[PDB]
Design a protein around this nucleic acid. Structure first.
Ligand SMILES: [Mg+2]
Ligand SMILES: [Mg+2]
Ligand SMILES: [Mg+2]
Ligand SMILES: [Mg+2]
Ligand SMILES: [Mg+2]
Ligand SMILES: [Mg+2]
Ligand SMILES: [Mg+2]
Ligand SMILES: [Mg+2]
Ligand SMILES: [Mg+2]
Ligand SMILES: [Mg+2]
Ligand SMILES: [Mg+2]
Ligand SMILES: [Mg+2]
Ligand SMILES: [Mg+2]
Ligand SMILES: [Mg+2]
Ligand SMILES: [Mg+2]
Ligand SMILES: [Mg+2]
Ligand SMILES: [Mg+2]
Ligand SMILES: [Mg+2]
Ligand SMILES: [Mg+2]
Ligand SMILES: [Mg+2]
Ligand SMILES: [Mg+2]
Ligand SMILES: [Mg+2]
Ligand SMILES: [Mg+2]
Ligand SMILES: [Mg+2]
Lengths: 37, 116, 64, 120, 109, 205, 40
RNA sequence: GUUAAUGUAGCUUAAAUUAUCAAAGCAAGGCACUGAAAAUGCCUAGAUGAGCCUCACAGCUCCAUUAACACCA
RNA sequence: AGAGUGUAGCUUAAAAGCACCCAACUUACACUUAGGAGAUUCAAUUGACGCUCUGA
RNA sequence: ACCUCGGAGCAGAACCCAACCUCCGAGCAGUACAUGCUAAGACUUCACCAGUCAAAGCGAACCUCAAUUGAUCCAAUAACUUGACCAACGGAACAAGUUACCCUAGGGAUAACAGCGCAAUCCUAUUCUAGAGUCCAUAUCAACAAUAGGGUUUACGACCUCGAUGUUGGAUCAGGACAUCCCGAUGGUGCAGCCGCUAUUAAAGGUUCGUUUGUUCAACGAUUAAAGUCCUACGUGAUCUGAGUUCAGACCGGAGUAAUCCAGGUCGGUUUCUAUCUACUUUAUUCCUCCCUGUACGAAAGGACAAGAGAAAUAAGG
RNA sequence: GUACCCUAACCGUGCAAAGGUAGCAUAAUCACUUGUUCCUUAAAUAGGGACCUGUAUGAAUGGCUCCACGAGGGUUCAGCUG
RNA sequence: CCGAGCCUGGUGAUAGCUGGUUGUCCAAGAUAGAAUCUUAGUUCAACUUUAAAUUUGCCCACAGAACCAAAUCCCCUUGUAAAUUUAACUGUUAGUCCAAAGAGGAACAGCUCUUUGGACACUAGGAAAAAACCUUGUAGAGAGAGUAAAAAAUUUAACACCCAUAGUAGGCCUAAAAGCAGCCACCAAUUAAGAAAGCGUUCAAGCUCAACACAAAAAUCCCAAACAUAUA
């Protein structure tokens, strides 16, 4: 398989793990801003 | 080498330009190619004035492509020489023309005719 | 990988985009005088040099 | 292709936040590492299988004193994913020839030079 | 349709790098075109190879290319350059280690 | 001429030498034609792909159809098809040379603008037929403004600054943290985990 | 899965649990400390 | 589909550079007129994209087309 | 009237180096080779002859 | 088509690096006639063979070109030297066709059949509204494209099998899928009724007989409520058949000097097994007639559903 | 080049030793080709009879009729029979 | 049993081809290539093994390697203990998948061909089973202990209500095209309704709107059982 395929190519599992570890975590505030005046 | 700070110390083809209409775009207005026809019946008076306009252009950094001649006509043969000029600024146009006017030796006629 | 140059590179300050308007060496001896002078100036790279290294007197003379 | 990896010098420039998380001093740093291999050399390239033989880390979970010099540290930067680096801290000093036979390296990384097996 | 092109590699390039000790006659760098030009105590063969003339240490430097005036191709490339332009080429030198001999006492006559 | 001009199937003089499929003109972020020049609204390429001549006819007919040429104009940002793609003749065995040149193709990388729009008109009159052309393209595409392009770029700058994940992809790949460069590319150091082949993950930091 | 589950064009998908995420994270924290002690 | 040859005036033959000639049509001439026989001209991007030289002139480049080949179950 | 000041054309040259002029080979330019003209504004770092500008 | 040598790309920066990969070339020409002799040190086309470079010295003077080539054999010549499109270019010798009369050794390293991979080709489903449909995108069909799915086809690959996995159709007996041809239940209609067209749902049951052809197909005859698309080793030959297709004979046309060949046609041509093990061996639909009624509907021509009754047919059980 | 119910010898310089004649013909005769049409069948890729671009028919590689003959290869009437 | 009988002899024909190659235990041990009537083989190299001699080997830092990307080469320190030479030979020279850079093909193949690196032909644990992915290598006994890799997460489409007079069928072009066939102008009444933004008329008329006001489908039979709530 080439490096550019027409389908989404299946990742190596150790590559699939750091795309799961380094996923974006949004900043969650302590109090929801719609619960504050 | 590529990974060293001395990369491209020996390159030179960007210092060599190895390989026309009237160019008046927005302010930098300049002519195209010019031709300067000088006709006289003396080969001595035509060849020697062909030098001086070429020496006047070289002293003013004006690009001279060709300096050839067209053949004679048997009237007595009138010798005609063409001096190709490109590029004059606004201030240069009246000044560069009036000195060739103010140096015409003996009955030779000028021309600012153009190409083809 | 590229590493930037340490000092100024040669043919850099004279480098322009117009090459027809710039006046040239037309000769070999004009280039060689500039070439010999540039070899004697100290440079930031390795070179061959690193490893293989009153008023009365004028008035009398102008009269003479 | 798969080549060796040049890790830039920016990665090994510690931030002042990092001196607070791990208890190190930038001025007067430690002298001796304690290197311990925690990953196998199998499924690793041959230039990491040989560096591990050069540092003596052929056995896993066996500590080894190495100097904190930029030539030993160049070998530890190759195989840093295989090992665990900790400073050898010395609460008492380095052992004399009388206290040479009563030492113990603890799991905190410290080398006690008097090791009885009696409680405090 | 595309026949030919099965030529092997020439194995050219630098045989003795920077700082290497090199005796007289050692080929320093074999090349196809003039990538490295000769310098001090380095000669050129017919096939543009660079061999060493003295026993010494190889150094690679960058200096000003002044071609020979009979070399009409490069001189016509020199005289198209702008007025501050200076060409450079990588030169290979041999820094000669030994002296060429000492004066030894033969006999008291 | 406020219309998309005719795009020809081939150049005037055609390419006589069969070029190899450099597939690296699809992968990665684009560098040419990423910003607006004499326009306001466009079609962003959120993924790489190849435009045949059929895509240019789709874009040219169904933009000139739904348009006011007295109030709108359009220009191309992708060139005419130049890269030759060579198909072997059907039902043949393997080997025996390289196939003859069949058709031509423009490569389009991710982040590339494809067409541009403009004139005395707003985005809501233009999101109609530019989001239907973007769906017919062989890559994931999007109708963008100048205001909604710089919004989605400054949003990802805000995603890259807010995230509570201590490990990003650039910190792990460039340091070779788990020996992870055994499973990555050399391209992944400048791709930073956002490009996987021809595709583009814009939610990834 | 058409042929040989883990190789080829169509493989069976493998997914990342909380085990495999936490195992890589605690190996990434030994690594971040490794970059600290080699920096001085 | 692969190998092989082919390219002509309005059409075909030829000429080994240069381009010949029988039909075709253009009129006039003999016949009451019309076909023939003469006596005259004409009609050739030599199928072509560039020119190493100069090229029907000869190799690439070629677009039509003509024969063989249109295996192997 | 005031300011800036000032080596031949230019010079963070100190009597210099480039620019510059003619003649011959060049259609001509260019190159080259033969030749050519050149200056520290005068008086003891200082003052007053000349130029540039801002004024009437 | 190719086989040797060289330049460039793949192979971006020491070297190297394949390909029936992509592009260019070479089998010489010219000028010298010290294009003499010698000799340190090296390079090396991944071995060897050959190929390169060279200071000093002797002797004089004051090679260009990327490739531009060919070993050994001792003879042709007095000697120095010279001799291959040995181009299959590390080179036997100048030795061809053919085999279905074939044989042997092997190979699943390697083809045909089947499985498998794959999905270009094929089939399908949605997205998009261009356009057809008087007007009207969406009753119906559908261009350019897009995103999915299937694994019927033509192909590709060469992974199991060549110490044998035996084939086209047919017979027999069928198992299954639903992407439904009929019967069932619904939504839409450019649905008045009758006929339809289209989609949702349903796999319980059913899905004909013949003439020509070895034919699957295909055409035609007569029917049917309908004469479904497929998969099952192109289901099933230790159940059967053998017309085609593969033999040994033979003409006919053509190719060849002939032997022989065509994939071109035609006549003829042995289908082996006593069952060891597994598995198994009694789990109601449809049509037509009549009636409703020539009513509803329709301007007519036409012409129904639902309910009811009777006749059949097949299937299963006797 | 021209036949003009698609039908004028009405002209034909290229050359070869000679340029397929009579007959038969979709043949056991490359493909095209289930060629065109009639009879035969309810239905005819079969069988028979006529027409010829049979551009690979053809005269002892023998051509064409006809009488007999055939465990030869096709087609058919009637009868008959699991 | 005749494409050339059968028997004996040469004959233990020859086979780069298949099959077979018999006590115990330990040790080292895998993939550059080139020539070849050669690619089913062999010779040389490379790799491997033993014995011997010696001195460096590997890892590497500044500096350095050309003009028309990842890295490598070279390289003292340093970490280390190996390497080169000499002597004697055998065998492997019919590889696979994965990651990466590419080529060919369809940016198809469990496809083909190079390169860099792994793993496999070697043990064990895991990914269900599993040569090639992940963890882990140096061997034994134990009814000890800490660990490594290691268990998939997702469930998605409501939406305005009200109201509509008027310069004028704006002119032109058009049989006439009036807000809507086309072009130009696009002002103006009342507090507020466009010389009209969708439908609709041969053209009109009518309807509204803007304006006031308030994702999935294939063939024997789905495929662990199950479970939202007890403290990392
Ligand atoms: Mg090459
Ligand atoms: Mg090679
Ligand atoms: Mg499988
Ligand atoms: Mg060698
Ligand atoms: Mg000499
Ligand atoms: Mg040979
Ligand atoms: Mg050979
Ligand atoms: Mg036979
Ligand atoms: Mg097969
Ligand atoms: Mg196989
Ligand atoms: Mg294979
Ligand atoms: Mg077999
Ligand atoms: Mg068997
Ligand atoms: Mg259904
Ligand atoms: Mg079957
Ligand atoms: Mg059976
Ligand atoms: Mg018989
Ligand atoms: Mg034997
Ligand atoms: Mg062992
Ligand atoms: Mg063999
Ligand atoms: Mg070293
Ligand atoms: Mg393979
Ligand atoms: Mg152990
Ligand atoms: Mg409203």
């Amino acid at each position: 398989s080439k490096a550019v395929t027409r389908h989404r190519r299946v990742m190596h599992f150790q590559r699939q793990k750091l795309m799961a570890v380094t996923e974006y975590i949004p900043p969650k505030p302590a109090i929801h801003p719609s619960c504050l005046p | 080498y590529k990974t060293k700070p001395t990369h491209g110390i020996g390159k030179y083809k960007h210092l060599i330009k190895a390989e026309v209409r009237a160019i008046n775009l927005g302010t930098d207005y300049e002519y195209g190619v010019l031709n300067i026809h000088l006709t006289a019946y003396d080969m001595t008076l035509a060849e020697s004035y062909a030098q001086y306009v070429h020496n006047l252009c070289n002293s003013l950094s004006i690009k001279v492509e060709e300096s050839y001649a067209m053949p004679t006509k048997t009237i007595l043969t009138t010798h005609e020489r063409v001096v190709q000029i490109s590029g004059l600024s606004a201030t240069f146009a009246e000044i560069f023309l009036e000195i060739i006017q103010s140096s015409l030796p003996e009955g030779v006629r000028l021309s600012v005719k153009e190409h083809t | 990988r590229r590493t930037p140059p340490l000092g100024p590179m040669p043919n850099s300050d004279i480098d322009l985009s117009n090459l027809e308007r710039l006046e040239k060496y037309r000769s070999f001896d004009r280039y060689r005088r500039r070439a010999e002078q540039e070899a004697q100036a100290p440079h930031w790279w390795r070179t061959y040099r690193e490893y293989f290294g009153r008023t009365q007197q004028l008035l009398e003379r102008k009269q003479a | 292709k798969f080549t060796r990896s040049r890790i830039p010098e920016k990665v090994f420039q510690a931030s002042p936040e990092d001196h607070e998380k791990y208890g190190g001093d930038p001025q007067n740093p430690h002298k001796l590492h304690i290197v311990t291999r925690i990953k196998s050399t199998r499924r690793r390239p041959y230039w990491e299988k040989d560096i591990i033989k050069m540092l003596g880390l052929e056995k896993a979970h066996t500590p080894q004193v190495h100097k904190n010099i930029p030539s030993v540290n160049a070998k530890l930067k190759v195989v840093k994913h295989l090992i665990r680096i900790k400073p050898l801290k010395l609460p008492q000093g380095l052992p004399a020839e009388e206290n040479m036979s009563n030492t113990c390296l603890k799991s905190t990384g410290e080398l006690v030079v008097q090791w009885h097996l009696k409680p405090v | 349709k595309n026949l030919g092109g099965k030529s092997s590699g020439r194995r050219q390039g630098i045989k003795k790098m920077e700082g290497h000790y090199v005796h007289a006659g050692n080929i320093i760098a074999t090349q196809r075109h003039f990538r490295w030009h000769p310098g001090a105590h380095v000669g050129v063969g017919k096939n543009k190879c660079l061999y060493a003339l003295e026993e010494g240490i190889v150094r690679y430097t960058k200096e000003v290319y002044v071609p020979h005036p009979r070399n009409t191709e490069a001189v016509d490339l020199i005289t198209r350059l702008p007025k501050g332009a200076v060409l450079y080429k990588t030169f290979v030198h041999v820094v000669p280690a030994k002296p060429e001999g000492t004066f030894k006492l033969v006999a008291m006559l | 001429k406020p219309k998309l001009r005719f795009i020809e199937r081939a150049p005037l003089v055609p390419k006589v030498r069969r070029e190899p499929k450099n597939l690296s003109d699809i992968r990665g972020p684009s560098t040419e034609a990423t910003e607006f020049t004499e326009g306001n609204f466009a079609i962003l390429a959120l993924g790489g792909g190849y435009l045949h001549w059929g895509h240019f006819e789709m874009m040219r007919l169904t933009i000139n159809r739904s348009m006011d040429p007295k109030n709108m104009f359009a220009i191309w940002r992708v060139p005419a098809p130049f890269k030759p793609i060579t198909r072997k003749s059907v039902g043949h065995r393997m080997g025996g040379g390289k196939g003859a040149i069949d058709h031509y193709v423009t490569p389009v990388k991710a982040g590339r603008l494809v067409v541009e729009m403009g004139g005395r008109c707003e985005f809501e009159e233009v999101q109609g037929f530019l989001d239907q052309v973007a769906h017919k393209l062989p890559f994931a595409a999007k109708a963008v403004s100048r205001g909604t392009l710089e919004k989605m770029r400054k949003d990802q700058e805000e995603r890259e600054r807010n995230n509570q994940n201590p490990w990003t992809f650039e910190r792990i790949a460039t340091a070779n943290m788990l020996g992870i460069r055994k499973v990555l590319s050399p391209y992944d150091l400048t791709h930073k985990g956002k490009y996987w082949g021809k595709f583009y993950m814009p939610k990834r930091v | 899965i058409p042929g040989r589950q883990w190789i080829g064009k169509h493989r069976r998908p493998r997914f990342v649990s909380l085990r495999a995420k936490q195992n890589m994270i605690r190996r990434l924290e030994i690594e971040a400390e490794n970059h600290y002690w080699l920096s001085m």
